[PDB]
């Protein structure tokens, strides 16, 4: 149970980028001027809390995005190429048991469906491209390898479901049940509710859908 979520990369000159992409993209970068990033995640209530995107290594859009982020002057090729082939040589274990978490940048911003916001695309170790759909939204306020991979990256931290108790997000992510912040018209859902709420407002919108 969760729910597929369309992030997608704006592209607002589509000529300058289409060699980074293949033709089975193309069509859709060239209509709606987006390349579509779905994400399943069973935590659809954290939506608006999601700072950046997280591609598995072999996710095929890793090197599409790195060409597009090299072309903006945002990513280093190389850093993520070598990055790629490093992950192909590690085991599950040895992206998993983290006591050093690894990614890169991709040089790319993700517009959340959610709220509009811009937030950077990685790739990193610690996702596993045989989850959902090989793409995760992060939100590292309330998830615990997010939160310590962002530790890592200096990546922001958004608070989204507020607990009823005191909790330092400074010390750790909070997985547990609140009512939403920082989540426009959804504040103040108790975020259990919050989870069908915003999945049906997604999916009424064509971005995303019940999973």
Known sequence: EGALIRFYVEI??????????????????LKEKRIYIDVFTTRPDTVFGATFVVLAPEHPL????????????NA???????????????????????????????????????????????????????????????VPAHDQRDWEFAKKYDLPIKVVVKPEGAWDFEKGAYEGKGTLV??????????????????????????????
């Open 76 to 138: 280093c090729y190389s850093d993520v190429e070598n990055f790629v082939e490093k992950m192909k040589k590690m085991s599950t274990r040895e992206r998993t048991m983290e006591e050093d978490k690894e990614g890169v940048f991709l040089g790319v911003y993700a517009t959340n469906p959610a709220n509009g916001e811009k937030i950077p695309v990685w790739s990193a170790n610690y996702v596993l491209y045989e989850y959902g759909t090989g793409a995760i939204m992060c």
């Open 182 to 211: 920082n989540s426009d018209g959804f504040d103040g859902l108790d975020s259990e509710t919050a989870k069908r709420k915003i999945t049906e407002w997604l999916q009424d919108r064509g971005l995303g859908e019940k999973k």
């Open 12 to 29: 607002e000159e589509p000529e300058k980028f289409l060699n980074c992409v293949p033709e089975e993209l193309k069509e859709t970068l």
């Open 62 to 73: 890793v090197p599409v995005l790195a060409c597009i982020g090299e072309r903006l002057g």
